[PDB]
Design an enzyme around this catalytic site. Structure first.
Site, PDB file in Angstrom:
ATOM      1  N   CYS A  65      11.952   2.037 -67.858  1.00 19.59           N
ATOM      2  CA  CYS A  65      12.157   1.740 -66.443  1.00 19.59           C
ATOM      3  C   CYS A  65      10.866   1.823 -65.605  1.00 19.59           C
ATOM      4  CB  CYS A  65      13.161   2.749 -65.875  1.00 19.59           C
ATOM      5  SG  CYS A  65      13.460   2.530 -64.105  1.00 19.59           S
ATOM      6  N   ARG A  68      10.730   4.210 -61.774  1.00 17.02           N
ATOM      7  CA  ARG A  68      10.951   5.646 -61.774  1.00 17.02           C
ATOM      8  C   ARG A  68      10.287   6.459 -60.659  1.00 17.02           C
ATOM      9  NH1 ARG A  68       9.235   7.390 -67.524  1.00 17.02           N
ATOM     10  NH2 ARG A  68       8.307   5.275 -67.773  1.00 17.02           N
ATOM     11  N   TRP A 237      18.047  -1.064 -57.203  1.00 15.75           N
ATOM     12  CA  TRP A 237      17.968  -2.433 -56.706  1.00 15.75           C
ATOM     13  C   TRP A 237      17.213  -3.238 -57.745  1.00 15.75           C
ATOM     14  CZ3 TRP A 237      15.934   1.659 -53.747  1.00 15.75           C
ATOM     15  CH2 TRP A 237      14.549   1.918 -53.939  1.00 15.75           C
ATOM     16  N   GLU A 242      13.868  -9.771 -63.011  1.00 19.94           N
ATOM     17  CA  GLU A 242      15.054  -9.620 -63.870  1.00 19.94           C
ATOM     18  C   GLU A 242      15.975 -10.815 -63.695  1.00 19.94           C
ATOM     19  OE1 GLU A 242      16.698  -5.449 -64.107  1.00 19.94           O
ATOM     20  OE2 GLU A 242      15.605  -5.418 -62.180  1.00 19.94           O
TER      21      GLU A 242
HETATM   22  C1  HEM Z   1      15.575   1.836 -57.739  1.00 17.43           C
HETATM   23  C2  HEM Z   1      15.317   0.619 -58.296  1.00 17.43           C
HETATM   24  C3  HEM Z   1      15.101   0.379 -59.744  1.00 17.43           C
HETATM   25  C4  HEM Z   1      14.318  -0.614 -60.252  1.00 17.43           C
HETATM   26  C5  HEM Z   1      13.578  -1.617 -59.390  1.00 17.43           C
HETATM   27  C6  HEM Z   1      14.369  -0.535 -61.671  1.00 17.43           C
HETATM   28  C7  HEM Z   1      13.711  -1.429 -62.535  1.00 17.43           C
HETATM   29  C8  HEM Z   1      14.089  -1.560 -63.869  1.00 17.43           C
HETATM   30  C9  HEM Z   1      13.798  -2.703 -64.689  1.00 17.43           C
HETATM   31  C10 HEM Z   1      13.113  -3.970 -64.206  1.00 17.43           C
HETATM   32  C11 HEM Z   1      14.304  -2.466 -65.937  1.00 17.43           C
HETATM   33  C12 HEM Z   1      14.269  -3.394 -67.149  1.00 17.43           C
HETATM   34  C13 HEM Z   1      15.683  -4.036 -67.246  1.00 17.43           C
HETATM   35  C14 HEM Z   1      15.866  -5.086 -68.298  1.00 17.43           C
HETATM   36  O1  HEM Z   1      14.904  -5.856 -68.620  1.00 17.43           O
HETATM   37  O2  HEM Z   1      17.008  -5.217 -68.853  1.00 17.43           O
HETATM   38  C15 HEM Z   1      14.867  -1.152 -65.903  1.00 17.43           C
HETATM   39  C16 HEM Z   1      15.402  -0.541 -67.024  1.00 17.43           C
HETATM   40  C17 HEM Z   1      16.021   0.704 -66.902  1.00 17.43           C
HETATM   41  N1  HEM Z   1      16.202   1.444 -65.764  1.00 17.43           N
HETATM   42 FE1  HEM Z   1      15.500   1.149 -63.995  1.00 17.43          FE
HETATM   43  N2  HEM Z   1      15.149   0.479 -62.045  1.00 17.43           N
HETATM   44  C18 HEM Z   1      15.628   1.114 -60.936  1.00 17.43           C
HETATM   45  C19 HEM Z   1      16.530   2.194 -60.837  1.00 17.43           C
HETATM   46  C20 HEM Z   1      17.065   2.864 -61.929  1.00 17.43           C
HETATM   47  C21 HEM Z   1      17.966   3.936 -61.873  1.00 17.43           C
HETATM   48  C22 HEM Z   1      18.537   4.480 -60.579  1.00 17.43           C
HETATM   49  C23 HEM Z   1      18.184   4.385 -63.176  1.00 17.43           C
HETATM   50  C24 HEM Z   1      19.046   5.493 -63.649  1.00 17.43           C
HETATM   51  C25 HEM Z   1      19.445   6.535 -62.891  1.00 17.43           C
HETATM   52  C26 HEM Z   1      17.428   3.523 -64.044  1.00 17.43           C
HETATM   53  C27 HEM Z   1      17.361   3.638 -65.420  1.00 17.43           C
HETATM   54  C28 HEM Z   1      16.874   2.557 -66.183  1.00 17.43           C
HETATM   55  C29 HEM Z   1      17.159   2.496 -67.627  1.00 17.43           C
HETATM   56  C30 HEM Z   1      17.885   3.510 -68.478  1.00 17.43           C
HETATM   57  C31 HEM Z   1      16.625   1.340 -68.077  1.00 17.43           C
HETATM   58  C32 HEM Z   1      16.638   0.815 -69.507  1.00 17.43           C
HETATM   59  C33 HEM Z   1      17.893  -0.037 -69.783  1.00 17.43           C
HETATM   60  C34 HEM Z   1      17.929  -0.561 -71.204  1.00 17.43           C
HETATM   61  O3  HEM Z   1      17.346   0.025 -72.154  1.00 17.43           O
HETATM   62  O4  HEM Z   1      18.615  -1.596 -71.426  1.00 17.43           O
HETATM   63  N3  HEM Z   1      16.745   2.634 -63.233  1.00 17.43           N
HETATM   64  N4  HEM Z   1      14.696  -0.597 -64.637  1.00 17.43           N
HETATM   65  C1  LIG Z   2      18.227  -6.973 -71.618  1.00 16.07           C
HETATM   66  N1  LIG Z   2      17.231  -7.349 -70.594  1.00 16.07           N
HETATM   67  C2  LIG Z   2      17.324  -8.774 -70.149  1.00 16.07           C
HETATM   68  C3  LIG Z   2      18.535  -9.034 -69.246  1.00 16.07           C
HETATM   69  N2  LIG Z   2      18.415  -8.175 -68.058  1.00 16.07           N
HETATM   70  C4  LIG Z   2      17.343  -8.435 -67.069  1.00 16.07           C
HETATM   71  C5  LIG Z   2      19.332  -7.116 -67.879  1.00 16.07           C
HETATM   72  C6  LIG Z   2      20.394  -6.943 -68.775  1.00 16.07           C
HETATM   73  N3  LIG Z   2      21.268  -5.931 -68.623  1.00 16.07           N
HETATM   74  C7  LIG Z   2      21.140  -5.060 -67.594  1.00 16.07           C
HETATM   75  C8  LIG Z   2      20.105  -5.185 -66.654  1.00 16.07           C
HETATM   76  C9  LIG Z   2      19.977  -4.193 -65.491  1.00 16.07           C
HETATM   77  C10 LIG Z   2      18.793  -3.242 -65.733  1.00 16.07           C
HETATM   78  C11 LIG Z   2      18.555  -2.460 -64.442  1.00 16.07           C
HETATM   79  C12 LIG Z   2      19.169  -1.192 -64.254  1.00 16.07           C
HETATM   80  C13 LIG Z   2      18.941  -0.522 -63.045  1.00 16.07           C
HETATM   81  C14 LIG Z   2      19.568   0.817 -62.741  1.00 16.07           C
HETATM   82  C15 LIG Z   2      18.163  -1.270 -62.356  1.00 16.07           C
HETATM   83  C16 LIG Z   2      17.499  -2.377 -62.329  1.00 16.07           C
HETATM   84  N4  LIG Z   2      16.709  -2.924 -61.370  1.00 16.07           N
HETATM   85  N5  LIG Z   2      17.729  -3.031 -63.505  1.00 16.07           N
HETATM   86  C17 LIG Z   2      19.181  -6.228 -66.804  1.00 16.07           C
HETATM   87 CL   LIG Z   3      20.859  -7.873 -64.735  1.00 14.96          CL
END
Ligand code: HEM
Ligand SMILES: CNCCN(C)c1cncc(CCc2cc(C)cc(N)n2)c1
Ligand SMILES: [Cl-]
Ligand code: HEM
Ligand SMILES: CNCCN(C)c1cncc(CCc2cc(C)cc(N)n2)c1
Ligand SMILES: C[C@H](O)[C@H](O)[C@H]1CNc2nc(N)[nH]c(=O)c2N1
Ligand SMILES: C[C@H](O)[C@H](O)[C@H]1CNc2nc(N)[nH]c(=O)c2N1
Ligand SMILES: [Cl-]
Lengths: 362, 362
Positions: A65, A68, A237, A242
């Site tokens: 993420c 963070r 958000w 994404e």
């Molecule tokens: C506040 C705004 C936030 C932004 C802008 C953000 C941004 C992102 C992005 C861009 C990803 C990659 C997602 C993907 O490609 O599928 C991600 C993954 C992740 N975020 Fe964040 N995030 C935020 C908040 C949070 C929160 C609140 C949590 C948990 C309390 C969190 C936990 C994670 C986790 C666990 C992943 C990995 C998901 C996976 O392995 O599929 N994020 N985040």
């Molecule tokens: C698997 N990654 C490619 C597709 N993609 C962008 C995606 C797929 N599955 C779930 C999410 C959401 C990930 C996420 C989680 C939180 C808390 C925030 C945030 N900005 N994005 C994204």
């Molecule tokens: Cl998504």
């Protein structure tokens, strides 16, 4: 072995958590209490303070993420009291409403009762609480292909989608003691969506694209001090890439780059014209413009990387090791324009954290 | 220990090389010959066939290279016969001319005598045979910052640069038995350069950008069957993003994105406008257009990734394990538009291969 694993994780978590909260003096007595509780009951119950800080630590430790920096302001909703499917449903509806906050999105997690003997109390089937359905029948593809298997599972259970490209999937979850999950339609008034327009290219609206405002991951397990909260949906958000570089662009998702090229007036015929790259940039500009115009929170990948740099600096200042997964932290467009691309990260797993778990469909 | 390491690498290489060349029957006798040679001399000498196939295998095993589909057509020039600095110089001039081939670039490697007791016979100081100088004096920055330390070393030795942003560094190398390296100016007639123009934006020429036609890495060690060829410069043709997304764009290189934004008529004020991303796309389009217009070989990152997919398929068909470094293989713009981004790669090191070595300046 299980009780030993539990106790060991408990000792580590309580020590670290109480240290961070300036409560190091209370560790000894709390651990004593916990060990008796484990002895008598086979498990232990987190205090509200422990649960809240644990969920925050879990976000802080999420290697994949980029967002963070803001880990310490996570809004933690304790729903360990739920016992019925109506209570679960209403809790999930409430999470959507309070996280959405009229567009000024609040990072939020709702925590349901944890597994007991590895026995789940509540099992959420949705990947995100708000997501579009996907269909694929005799050559015909509709909606989001990433949702095809979950969509088929819902339709097995009596739900029927309208087969637009943006059908909202119902909430779907199973309670301990029930053989089948139940499902509930999302009230549309709870779900903010944003139509995608471009700041300069009027024709962009011809694509009739939209996306939902809030990403709420609902199928990961929160692990805190050896306790497994398999049902604990959370949201932030969006980072615009994404939506613009993946959900709307991937060939196995909405696959819109050729259509984007056509509406922005460029040929999609020669790799050397870099038309996919140009289309990606304009689609991503449109996504950010559209969210901003509607007053729905979003961050661009440059600003997000800058915030993440501050997160690295803050970790160093606090004397905490930084962990990260470079392959996920770099944005999918212009990654070398961010500082992330030019350094490396230790991908070690530190707990508390959020983990994948097996899907009950598929 | 050294002789044992040599013999072990020798056995492995000869077996594999001769297997690939359909010469498995000859392995036994060749190994016998090699072991006696190692016993008597402390080393062994590659046959021309072994040296050629070894250099090809080394490219094939280069985890960081997306261009490996064409490994088997590498042009290998055997210069193990050189003994004087004039011969080294003329060999390096010849490599430039034959690799350039009037713009129809030929992937080529020139192999000089190998280390003996770990004692280098020829030590090349240049990072690439053709590269621009860089200067940084009292706040003033000129040319390519990546070359500042080598430029300073050359000027210590009596060379003087004109201090344009594109001064060609001289060839600089040291012979066994000499305390200092010698340097030689590159004849301009040997060096093709390409002015950067844009296919649609006439003003782009106002930036007065150019780049050289052929990237010729000259400071890596080729290792084949335990023999260390520390001097073995090699070249391919450019992938356009190397020039447009890195050399001309990185803040610590030519840092041109703000200037690009201005000439393409967009503001460079707000991250949410994605102006860096847009500038990157137009600069990269200009680089490909300009090379093509001049008839100098180049590949775009989409076509390169497609070729690399074929390389993966060919490895599987030949029953060879594929190795790769995902972090280097993904292109620095639109990486998720390539298949590389969506799979993983085993980053194991297999020999023959090309390796980094310590710089004699710095
Ligand atoms: C506040 C705004 C936030 C932004 C802008 C953000 C941004 C992102 C992005 C861009 C990803 C990659 C997602 C993907 O490609 O599928 C991600 C993954 C992740 N975020 Fe964040 N995030 C935020 C908040 C949070 C929160 C609140 C949590 C948990 C309390 C969190 C936990 C994670 C986790 C666990 C992943 C990995 C998901 C996976 O392995 O599929 N994020 N985040
Ligand atoms: C698997 N990654 C490619 C597709 N993609 C962008 C995606 C797929 N599955 C779930 C999410 C959401 C990930 C996420 C989680 C939180 C808390 C925030 C945030 N900005 N994005 C994204
Ligand atoms: Cl998504
Ligand atoms: C034929 C055209 C070729 C193309 C298009 C190509 C493409 C590339 C690219 C884009 C890189 C990354 C460079 C960087 O970011 O610094 C690279 C790295 C590399 N290539 Fe190739 N390449 C080609 C030919 C060759 C040849 C002929 C060899 C050797 C015989 C070679 C060996 C390597 C090695 C060793 C690296 C890694 C360099 C490092 O670690 O710094 N390539 N290649
Ligand atoms: C270190 N990477 C960023 C700077 N960069 C793009 C770069 C630096 N130093 C050397 C090269 C050339 C790499 C190379 C080698 C060969 C044989 C071919 C090719 N197309 N590129 C590139
Ligand atoms: C720290 C990080 O590994 C480093 O910036 C790498 C990442 N990927 C790369 N990939 C290529 N092709 N070239 C590079 O110089 C780099 N830099
Ligand atoms: C195979 C590869 O690791 C996979 O495609 C990853 C790479 N990096 C990623 N990074 C993010 N943020 N999200 C993703 O889905 C992926 N996919
Ligand atoms: Cl280069």
């Amino acid at each position: 072995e299980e009780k030993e694993i539990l106790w060991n994780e408990a000792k580590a978590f309580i020590a670290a958590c109480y240290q961070e909260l300036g409560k190091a003096a209370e560790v000894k007595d709390r651990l004593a209490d916990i060990k008796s509780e484990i002895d008598l009951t086979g498990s232990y119950v987190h205090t509200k303070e422990e649960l809240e800080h644990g969920a925050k630590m879990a976000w802080r430790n999420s290697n994949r993420c980029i967002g963070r920096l803001f880990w310490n302001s996570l809004n933690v909703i304790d729903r360990r009291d739920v016992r019925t499917k109506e209570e679960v449903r209403d809790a999930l509806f409430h999470h959507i409403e309070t996280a959405t906050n009229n567009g000024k999105i609040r990072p939020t997690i709702t925590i349901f009762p944890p597994e007991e003997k590895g026995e789940k109390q509540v099992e959420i089937w949705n990947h995100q609480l708000i997501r579009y359905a996907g269909y694929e029948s005799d050559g015909e593809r509709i909606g989001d292909p990433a949702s095809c298997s979950l969509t088929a599972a819902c339709e097995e259970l009596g739900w029927r989608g309208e087969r637009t490209d943006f059908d909202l999937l119902p909430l779907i979850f199973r309670m301990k003691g029930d053989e089948q999950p139940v499902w509930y339609e999302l009230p549309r008034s709870l779900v903010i969506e944003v139509p995608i327009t471009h700041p300069d290219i009027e024709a962009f609206s011809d694509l009739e694209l939209k996306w939902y405002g809030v990403p709420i991951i609902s199928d990961m397990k929160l692990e805190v001090g050896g306790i497994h909260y398999n049902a604990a949906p959370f949201n932030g958000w969006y980072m615009g890439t994404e939506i613009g570089a993946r959900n709307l662009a991937d060939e196995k998702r909405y696959d819109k780059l050729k259509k984007v090229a056509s509406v922005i007036g460029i040929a999609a015929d020669y790799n050397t014209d870099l038309w996919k790259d140009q289309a990606l940039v304009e689609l991503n500009k449109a996504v950010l413009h559209s969210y901003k115009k509607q007053g729905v929170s979003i961050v661009d990948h440059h600003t997000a990387a800058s915030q993440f740099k501050r997160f690295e600096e803050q970790a160093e200042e606090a004397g905490r090791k930084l962990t990260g997964d470079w392959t996920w932290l770099i944005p999918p467009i212009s990654p070398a324009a961010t500082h992330i691309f030019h350094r490396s990260y230790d991908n070690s797993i530190v707990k508390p954290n959020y983990f994948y778990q097996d899907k009950p469909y598929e």
